[PDB]
Ligand SMILES: CCCCCCCCCCCCO[C@@H]1O[C@H](CO)[C@@H](O[C@H]2O[C@H](CO)[C@@H](O)[C@H](O)[C@H]2O)[C@H](O)[C@H]1O
Ligand SMILES: COCCOCCOCCOc1ccc(C(C)(C)CC(C)(C)C)cc1
């Protein structure tokens with residue numbers, strides 16, 4: 001029975017990891033874009049077009 | 056259509072015209088001799104690019120803040 005338990009536990013763990021990390025990252029992105037849209041001196045590719053994307 | 060006097064510019068006698076002065080030892084100064092002193096802008100072109108960017112950006116910032 002512990003095999004079933006560990007399988008369920010790690011499946012739920014992977015689901016939570018993917019979902020929460022994607023959601024948090026997107027939320028931080030949206031807050032930063034709100035700050036830059038409200039301050040267009042900063043609405044510029046301030047890290048770089050490819051640097052941030054590669055990172 | 057018009058007489059030869061009108062064409063040649065004189066009725067009887069062609070009058071002498073005083074020639075143009077030259078001012079030896081220096082360039083002529085006329086309305087058409089000014090590019091010798093004033094060429095097209097060539098010294099601050101890159102500063103022009105930078106300042107146009109900064110002007111656009113600062114204007115956009117303050118306009119968005121005013122509108123909001
Ligand atoms: C064609 C159909 C019938 C209509 C005919 C009449 C048409 C008239 C309109 C055209 C007028 C042109 O006017 C023209 O002016 C110039 C000035 O620039 C005169 O120019 C004249 O004076 C100048 C200086 O003042 C002299 O250096 C020059 O040698 C002499 O030609 C011309 O002599 C005249 O012909
Ligand atoms: C309404 O606008 C006012 C216009 O005023 C014109 C200003 O004219 C003053 C010009 O003064 C000089 C004098 C000499 C020169 C030199 C001879 C030094 C220029 C040179 C070496 C490029 C030929 C340049 C400018």
Ligand SMILES: COCCOCCOCCOc1ccc(C(C)(C)CC(C)(C)C)cc1
Pocket residue numbers: 081084089092093
């Ligand atoms: C776009 O142009 C607008 C303004 O144009 C100004 C043109 O100025 C040129 C002035 O011409 C001169 C140049 C030199 C001089 C001096 C007196 C400096 C010459 C000198 C010392 C040799 C006698 C006088 C007039």
